[PDB]
Assembly symmetry: C3
């Protein structure tokens, strides 16, 4: 993890206007966590000296969660407010205003809307930045559609000249496919200086953090650009199309990891698995299944098809078919479905059965108890090896 005293600025003060939502962009969720939660989790895991989230637009709606996140990650996370919305450059300034004017450690700048950014990418960025002893290193990548992204300008020797933002890009610059990831590692002194030379002149009368690269190029300073070949790692979310695209990509990776760890997943494209979910060896997951929240599946289970489980605990060798359930537990070797509905507080004992058109709410159903079909069981406590219906 991080060298230290590394200080990380997380930039989350812009309007995600293109989301077309009344909920703030970085709060939109993905695989069981908001984009912001994703970022904060990867960052925390490296343990910077400082960690400073910059708020702005809708800050009163986001702050709580940062605090939630701090206590969850057992770490202190500072919040810096952006006075007015004068751009990303200004935004980084507020961020720094959270550090001692004598702070020396390098500074990593990142955004709140790149949910797939992982540890290795961040560790690589630091190591590269230290290796080439750069002033700024900037993570780039190449996309089939650079739309919306800052473009990377390189002379024939691949030396980086600057970054032009989509708004300020010329029709020929727009053709450039190498994009600015928006993940930086700055030497702090270099950084502060470069910020003091920003011009609101062009082209959204804001202070572009991206302008810092040309400035540092200019003033005889060392400027490195590290290209991330796996783009998903560093892609950003601006609209709900991108959100879904990234969701699917991350799901792909979650499922795949479960498969290599011994879980048969019949149709990955339609099996949705949240990041906290655990699944046991030789379990089989059939199509149209979502496993959400803190759902746990033991080994040798059969789950699905068409099963939705949120925060459900499932024992070994259980059968969970066409079941809609949440906040419940299902015992070893138990059989559930098809067409079964588990409401919060259902606890079904080992080898128990809940058959078709059965609904359970707030009930404990003992070991080996069967509820064959067409029956509701609410707020009940049913002993072991009974039968029930209707």
């Amino acid at each position: 993890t991080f060298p230290g005293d590394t200080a990380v600025l997380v930039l989350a003060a812009g309007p995600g206007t293109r989301m077309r939502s009344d909920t703030p962009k970085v709060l939109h969720t993905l695989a069981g966590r908001s984009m912001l939660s994703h970022v904060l989790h990867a960052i925390a895991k490296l343990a910077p000296q400082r960690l400073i989230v910059v708020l702005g637009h809708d800050h009163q709606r986001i702050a709580p969660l940062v605090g939630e996140l701090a206590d969850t990650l057992g770490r202190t996370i500072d919040v810096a407010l952006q006075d007015r919305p004068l751009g990303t450059g200004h935004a980084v300034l507020c961020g720094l205003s959270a550090l001692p004017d004598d702070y020396a450690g390098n500074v990593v700048v990142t955004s709140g809307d790149t949910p797939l950014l992982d540890a290795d990418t961040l560790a690589d960025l630091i190591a590269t930045h230290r290796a080439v002893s750069a002033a700024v290193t900037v993570l780039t990548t190449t996309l089939d559609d650079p739309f919306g992204y800052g473009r990377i300008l390189r002379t024939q020797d691949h030396e980086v000249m600057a970054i032009v933002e989509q708004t300020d890009a010329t029709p020929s610059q727009r053709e450039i496919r190498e994009v600015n990831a928006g993940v930086y590692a700055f030497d702090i002194a270099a950084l502060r200086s470069a910020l003091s030379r920003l011009s609101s002149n062009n082209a959204q009368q804001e202070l572009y953090l991206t302008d810092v690269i040309a400035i540092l190029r200019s003033d005889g300073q060392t400027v490195h650009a590290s290209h991330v070949d796996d783009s998903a790692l560093v892609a950003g979310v601006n609209n709900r199309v991108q959100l879904a695209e990234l969701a699917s990509e991350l799901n792909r990776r979650v499922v795949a990891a479960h498969q290599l760890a011994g879980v048969t997943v019949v149709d990955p494209a339609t099996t949705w698995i949240d990041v906290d979910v655990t699944i046991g060896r030789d379990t089989v997951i059939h199509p149209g299944t979502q496993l959400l929240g803190r759902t746990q599946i033991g080994g040798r289970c059969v789950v699905g098809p068409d099963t939705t489980l949120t925060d459900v605990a499932v024992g070994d060798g259980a059968s969970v078919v066409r079941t809609h359930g949440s906040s419940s537990s299902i015992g070893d070797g138990a059989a559930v479905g098809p067409f079964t509905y588990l409401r919060p507080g259902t606890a079904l004992g080992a080898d128990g059965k809940l058959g078709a058109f059965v609904e359970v709410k707030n009930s404990t159903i003992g070991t080996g108890t069967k509820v064959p079909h067409l029956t509701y069981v609410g707020d009940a406590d049913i002993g072991e090896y009974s039968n029930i219906g209707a």
Copy 2:
């Protein structure tokens, strides 16, 4: 829209033998409309002077719908019958036989089996055709598998020489990937003349409309070929594999448009949305959902997973989960599912609840009324704020 007096021939008189169906090809449906309906809709929206659908094989089965379509589009749509099946050239002839022998406006020829063809493509074709003052302009494109399509023959100066049909293509011509879209814009005089010189000689002893290009090339006439880079726009349906491929592509576009307009769609690949469907801001759609016919969803709803709604009206902030419903309405803030079945004539009031294993037919269920579970409600009128079961 169209310049006028533009006359459009829609060619729908061939057997879609490769569909392997007893239903006529152009009648097969896609995203809530038949291929023919799709075409007629895009064409109508430009408002040609004349609009002439050519029937032939199975014409008694298709005509009604053209008439349905005419009255639906508030427009007069003529039908021309093909006497015998002597090819596309002949077919265009019958089409013209619906125009005054003194008709002057340009003539656009199109087919009934290119369901994704949109306004811009057609407007571009006319503008190009007028710009270059062509005799014929023909829409082309490039496919990974040109199979079945007419091939575009170009000399080294990209001048178009002719179009060779798949049947008459040589093994080396078959390698050509640029295909004939089958969308033409003809200067009428040029057209009539070129048709009078068609030879049934080769290679299905028919009169190929495609042969017109070589003829006009030949007789010192101006021949343009406009390439449509977005192939889906101009792809044709010959078999059910192609139908499904295009269905999926159009769905992709429908969902995407909803996403950019503010709707969260968790898994686009498994969310099917018909073209007339409306969806409100910040609504969330979970996987395995179809929204069909004239289904309307308000804002801030939660729909799915595994939900199928056809011609259902849903208010704001409603919850519609694992529900199979048609021709019904669901009030603001109402909760439905999981495992709920709505038969035609269900009208559920605002804040009403229909829980698991509940079926409603032809019933009005008042505001705030709950039907918790395992209950059938038929032909009933239930007042406000009641409870029901079983």
Copy 3:
């Protein structure tokens, strides 16, 4: 089919350690058959003189099924045990130990974990091998990720020099994308000789069957390498990611074949169809449907959405919607669903109805009998044209 006296060795004696399962790799299932069953089926259909499956790791768990398979394919299938696990070369040796020391016919070597290998690929391999009068012909192909595969080494004249296994490959050899399929056709004498010269020296101290190619190259012998452009045909399964990838690919092909034969499949990506399944003309299959085992669907049916049928027989013009069923039959023009559960032994007569939240077990329900909703019917015999509930 095969020339004869062709003898085929099927190699299934290695640990599929990367499956991370307690079930032997070649036993993992795909589209209604285990990988091994797939291979044996394609091989049998060519009717070699001899057919010899080599077992080893977990052989007591696999043998039964080979015997099951032999009697199923009405053919004698020999099993050869590998004494110790000394590699693929050794493995082929045991295989040969099942043949007469005077056996003359050519020998095809294949593995148990290439479930998509089809007749044409195998027939081509023999014809090529005989044509070029090769000593060994080896099926190759090119993958985007050669990981795990033997690499093909070719000099500038595309002459094949050898095959280097992933373990023994150098970082530059690892870049080679052309892989060894692991499907061989050997002239027997040449083969036996080449095996007697194998060195356990490198790099997993085993006897690599792949080393045979370099040996035969070396000793002035004719060595051919036939490249299979359709990789899926010849891809192998080492982990559950690959299993799912191949499953999906084979499903793609099964569905597509049904589509071209006249079946509308709305969403192929979510329609799963086992290889024995039959479906009738103009039937429509809606999303989230699996058709498993020996399920038969007549013509003009409507199946799905969200329907799972295993070994179910369905008549013409039936409706089967959101139904979970197995080992049952459903009559012509019958209507089933939504939310219907058919347990083994359900036989529903023509024009019968089983509505929502209905479960049937071990029952015969006569012609035109309705069970509207919310009803269980077990072990019953219900006459024609009755009504039932509840």
